[PDB]
Amino acid sequence: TFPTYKCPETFDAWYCLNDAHCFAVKIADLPVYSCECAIGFMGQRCEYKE
């Protein structure tokens, strides 16, 4: 399991939608930012109301 970290500020502010939370991992020295969606939402930015 990869540890997760707080996102940089621009990502933390704007990237994840619909009350989703941004989280960062580092894979082979590269930061990858992702969104943990609230229930009922899906997508890269949790932009789709599933």
From Swiss-Prot:
Localization terms from the record: Cell membrane; Endoplasmic reticulum membrane; Golgi apparatus membrane
Tissue expression per record: Expressed throughout the embryo.
Part of the whole protein covered: 76 to 125 of 234
Post-translational modification: Proteolytic processing by Rhomboid occurs in the Golgi. Cleavage takes place within the transmembrane domain close to residue 144 and the active growth factor is released.
S-S bonds: 7-22, 16-35, 37-46
UniProt organism field: Drosophila melanogaster
Record's subunit section: Interacts with Star via the lumenal domain.
Residue ranges constituting the EGF-like domain according to the UniProt record: 3-47
This protein's name: Protein spitz
Lineage: Eukaryota, Metazoa, Ecdysozoa, Arthropoda, Hexapoda
Gene: spi
Taxonomy, superkingdom: Eukaryota
Function: Ligand for the EGF receptor (Gurken). Involved in a number of unrelated developmental choices, for example, dorsal-ventral axis formation, glial migration, sensory organ determination, and muscle development. It is required for photoreceptor determination.
